[PDB]
Amino acid sequence: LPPAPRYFQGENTAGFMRPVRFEGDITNLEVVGEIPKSIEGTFYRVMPEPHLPSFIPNDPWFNGDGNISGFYFKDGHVDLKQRYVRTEKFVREAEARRSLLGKYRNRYTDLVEFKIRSTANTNIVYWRGQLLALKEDSPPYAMDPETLETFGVYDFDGQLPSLTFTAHPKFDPVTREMVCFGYEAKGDGTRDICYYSFGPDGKIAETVWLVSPVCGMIHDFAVTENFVIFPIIPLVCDVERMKQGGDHWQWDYSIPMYIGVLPRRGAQGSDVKWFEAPHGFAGHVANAFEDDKGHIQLQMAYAKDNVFFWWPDANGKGPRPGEVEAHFANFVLDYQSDKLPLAEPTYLVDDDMEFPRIDDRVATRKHKHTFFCIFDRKPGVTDFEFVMPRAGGGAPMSNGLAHLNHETGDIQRYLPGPRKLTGECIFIPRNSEAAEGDGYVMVLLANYEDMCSELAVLDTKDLTNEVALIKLPVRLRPGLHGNWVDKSDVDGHPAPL
Amino acid sequence: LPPAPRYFQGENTAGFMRPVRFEGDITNLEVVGEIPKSIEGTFYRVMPEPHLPSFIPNDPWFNGDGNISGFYFKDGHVDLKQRYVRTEKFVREAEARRSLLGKYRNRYTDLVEFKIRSTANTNIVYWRGQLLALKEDSPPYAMDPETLETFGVYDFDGQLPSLTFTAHPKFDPVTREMVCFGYEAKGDGTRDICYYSFGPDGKIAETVWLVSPVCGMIHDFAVTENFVIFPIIPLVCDVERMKQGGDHWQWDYSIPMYIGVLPRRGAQGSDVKWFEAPHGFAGHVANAFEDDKGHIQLQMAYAKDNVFFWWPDANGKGPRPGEVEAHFANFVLDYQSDKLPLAEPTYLVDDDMEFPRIDDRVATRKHKHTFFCIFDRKPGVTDFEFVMPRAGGGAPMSNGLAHLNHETGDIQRYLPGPRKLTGECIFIPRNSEAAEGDGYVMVLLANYEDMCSELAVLDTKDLTNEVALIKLPVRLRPGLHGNWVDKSDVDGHPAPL
Ligand SMILES: [Cl-]
Ligand SMILES: [Cl-]
Ligand SMILES: [Fe+2]
Ligand SMILES: [Fe+2]
Structure with a gap:
């Protein structure tokens, strides 16, 4: 078989992109500022994160095993739970203690025959009391919202x-x-x-x-x-x-x-x-x-x-x-x-x-109302001289959030700082009676100074200011999509306006 | 009550001493070099690591909650498991989401009445199929060697x-x-x-x-x-x-x-x-x-x-x-x-x-044969200008291991490098037939360049050379004592010479 490397090499796994690959818990995260005590629910996000070094050189970011983060908020406190999706890939590679799946979406390069090739690493959504970990080449993997246990590949009661x-x-x-x-x-x-x-x-x-x-x-x-x-x-x-x-x-x-x-x-x-x-x-x-x-x-x-x-x-x-x-x-x-x-x-x-x-x-x-990531090349906004050597490669870069009001045309921009980049944000209604776009925004920051991740909480009344900054002691690798599941929503999804 | 801080402040929790407070697993650790395939067993070590910020300013290092690391070795692969001892202190402070125990070994400063005040943070030993997490002001806490589940305070079948x-x-x-x-x-x-x-x-x-x-x-x-x-x-x-x-x-x-x-x-x-x-x-x-x-x-x-x-x-x-x-x-x-x-x-x-x-x-x-930590102030051995600003305080410093042969008087010194410090080592007999002091030494390194921990494996034939270097993606805070439990030893302890 092609030799299995015993450590990560290449740009896609260097610096801030180096896999951590931890599963478990960090309760009572450190907070600078104050998390609004009315916020109650969970921010779920997924990142590709290779569990084992690939035998494919320069394997793209999109081909990493899905690792789910949950940030559980209540009464101004927040806990992190983190767990890999138990895909067929994950389980069989864990048994063998080496990579077996080959190139992105190319089964002819696999070292064994897989039934399901999902890394389940793109999105994580809530549906009828389960999480669904999504990858567009495969069915969803169903997971427990509380424990992040993987139930298995999900076919909607044989209806899929x-x-x-x-x-x-x-x-x-x-x-x-x-x-x-x-x-x-x-x-x-x-x-x-x-x-x-x-x-x-x-x-x-x-x-x-x-x-x-x-x-x-x-x-x-x-x-x-x-x-x-x-x-x-x-x-x-x-x-x-x-x-x-x-x-x-x-x-x-x-x-x-x-x-x-x-x-x-x-x-x-x-x-x-x-x-x-x-x-x-x-x-x-x-x-x-x-x-x-x-x-x-x-x-x-x-x-x-x-x-x-x-x-x-x-x-x-x-x-x-x-x-x-x-x-x-x-x-x-x-x-x-x-x-x-x-x-x-x-x-x-x-x-x-x-x-x-x-x-x-x-x-x-x-x-x-639309919230979105921005990448501003205007000099000074990102200190590229500092960040790029620490950044690795393979993953999209974003150095702010923007809020567009479509009626007025007004735009607010959140800039975390010259040595920080952002991921995809979530929006949280202030309460069940809030107007469209009124509430809180959360976004995971990569801090290249500390080589740590942070979770920023913003109020939509002033997107430029951090109401709270949750300081993780570990890196969460740049990820993809995430979702808010509010505690006040029984089916996990907000009520219509 | 005295106000509970929501993030760590002070020298005892700065830089490399900043608590991480993670529990869980990192399997298939990255290895540079080659772990001898004959090594089979577990390295257990304990570190003080405050789960919650103390209400006592500049709380000494010795007063942090015991967090157990296990490094499980087989066939040249190694996995990490990490879990806090469920002391009375840990459990009650986790319920309250704030610190309650006061000054080191002074119950008159506690905010509630504790029956047992152990942090179980000093040593971790194997006895008759259990781990015993030790703190000299208290009975042991018994733990599962495989899962690091805490069974509870242990009184040796009422004989203690x-x-x-x-x-x-x-x-x-x-x-x-x-x-x-x-x-x-x-x-x-x-x-x-x-x-x-x-x-x-x-x-x-x-x-x-x-x-x-x-x-x-x-x-x-x-x-x-x-x-x-x-x-x-x-x-x-x-x-x-x-x-x-x-x-x-x-x-x-x-x-x-x-x-x-x-x-x-x-x-x-x-x-x-x-x-x-x-x-x-x-x-x-x-x-x-x-x-x-x-x-x-x-x-x-x-x-x-x-x-x-x-x-x-x-x-x-x-x-x-x-x-x-x-x-x-x-x-x-x-x-x-x-x-x-x-x-x-x-x-x-x-x-x-x-x-x-x-x-x-x-x-x-x-x-x-004796193995021991050394602190050498000989210029160049430690780059203090680089390390000290990143080091925090409260914890003893060691910048090498030494092996003394008491017969010959020979001394070998392992120096991990100018930007690394060591913890307490363990010795592993090469096999059940090995001579005294012949085998492997393991020691956890703090790498101040990467702000990561590493586990070094040395052969006693040449202590100056790393046979393997296991690269953790997280910091393990400076700890105290640890022990080897060899798989070949039924009662967990090596056979007499
Ligand atoms: Cl599972
Ligand atoms: Cl337990
Ligand atoms: Fe997408
Ligand atoms: Fe001691």
Whole structure:
């Protein structure tokens, strides 16, 4: 077998990116300032964190084992619980005490045959009394919200129609449905998309099979009252490339960014319209909604080149690190229109941004507040001379949060400091009676001075000021998505406005 | 109540001394080099580590909650398990989410009435299938060797005759007895010493009550074939001082270092002879044995002034930090002699040293190998300019290990490097057939460059070279005592030579 390294080597595991790989508890975290005593609930986030050194050199960040963090808040105190998802990968590699899974989404490089290849490392959501740890190439893994015990791969009581479950399901605040899909839904390289939904009682509602024009990556999607929208990233899969040991994904400069629109209820596969946006990268969806005219407003991060530059085109052509900016874009779509090409989007702000969150009480409906990560290259904002040597590589960088009020156009920016970077934030309603976007924001900071992580608590009345700063004595590796589960919400999700 | 701080402040909890307070697992630790595959067993060590910020300012290091580390070795792989002892203190403070226990060994400063005040933070030993977490003001806490679950305060099936159990019991390799004592054995300020032993079947054997000439600290003791020896540190307790909120311990310049000698078997309390060594500080015992003439050779660390300088004499007089050196001393005692004063000891080496270990297969018998910590002020050995600002305070410093061969007089010194310090080492016999002192040495390093801990594995054939260096991604706070439990030893203790 390929030799198993006994320590981590390479840029993707250097400095702040060095795996810690701890599981357990740290109760009564140190706090500077004061956590509002009314806050009660749990912040769950997931990070890729290789449990064992890969036999693949420069294994991408996206291929690390999912490690779940829970920050449990009550009465101004907070405890951390941390535990790896017991994926098939995790368990079998733990038995062997060496890495066995090979390249990202390429089973032909694995040292053993896996049934499920999930690292469960992308998102962690709450559904009907369980956590679901998500990875878009696989079904969810179900976990206990209290102990972070892994129950196992989850198939919704045998109802799951797809081999794949998106990392970005949407929760309708009115109907209390979880709206889902999977791409490559019948296996590697398939153009099959399965759109499906679950009612609050756990019964499957919608199940529609449709066909993608290309086998492209559909990372995120959008849901409105009457439509579901599938933006396709021009990364394309060829299984024959994979069989020769090549990458699952390869950029294609010759295609548009397809945006499929399907009726949300009662549709057939052939009812999908594949609109054609200008070539670019479909980033994370903030939210989508129907306006007065019945037109879809789709607000999402959008770049003009390949953000995932480590998967270039067939001739190795692509941007360099730190080159590509994504911007907060608004696309307009009309399902009635027979004109497939779409106009260039309008931009809501000028900042290089990603990881947009809204007040999920208005998800699928008109929203007027968005919180998002920003990366500002203006000199001084980040002390790059200090940070970059300590930072390692492989992971996106963010040096502030921004709050956009869509009505007024006002923007507040939180800047943690010159030697700190941020992850994706969460929004917490101040209480069940709070106005849209009124409450608290939490964000995990990497502190490159201390080589420690911190959890910042902000009040939306003044996003520039930290109300509290929770000081972890360990590093939490840069992660991906996270969610708030409020104690006052029985089903784990906030009530509609 | 006195206000509970919500983060750690002061020198005793700054830099590398900042509490981490994690419990759980890190499996498959990173290794540079190669762990000998024949090594099979567990290295247990304990560190004081406050779970909650004290309401006592500048609470000494010795008063922190006991946190147990286990390093489990097999086939060249190693896993870490870490868990706090569930003392009464730990449990009740965890319930309240604030500190409740007050000053070191002073119940009159506690905010609630404790039955047991142990932090169980001094030593961790193996006895009849359990770990015993030790603190000399209390009975042991029993723990599971595999899971580090706390069973509870342990009284040896109701046989424990003393309120107190030494942190330094001795294991006779021939008789398989655990030889014990407790001082202040009938409560605060009492001069009662209880000497007791347990046979390998768990039945109590010896129980002898004797009287100390002063209420002084007896931290360590020594056991020979026919005698037990009690060196008294000239720190003295006055309960009336304590009732006014004063220190449990206070140095007394006017007394000798008493060294009691009692027959090991069949004695009465009045059979003890209190010999009088020159005034000084009784450090840790390496080992003691009877020579051919029947004279006791007592080898221990010995200083000429108060090592615990933070507890000065009645007028506040004492040495400053880093001033007092301890030296590896040999005292000669004859139980037959009626001459109470003892001659100055001979010194075996010139190094400033502490934390002596022997090959415990010859404990209570003639030994000819000793391993010990050293602190070398020779320029360059420690980069103090770099380390001291990162080090915090309160904890003893050691910048190497030394191996003394007592026959040849040869000394090897392990120096981890200019920006690293060491804790107490363990010795592991190479196998059940190995000669005295032949095998492996392990020692936990604090790496001030990375602000991480490392576990070094050395071969006794060349102590200057690291065979393996296990790289922890977290800090383990400077700790106290630790022990090896070999898998090949049924009762957890090595077989006699
Ligand atoms: Cl589990
Ligand atoms: Cl326990
Ligand atoms: Fe994502
Ligand atoms: Fe000790």
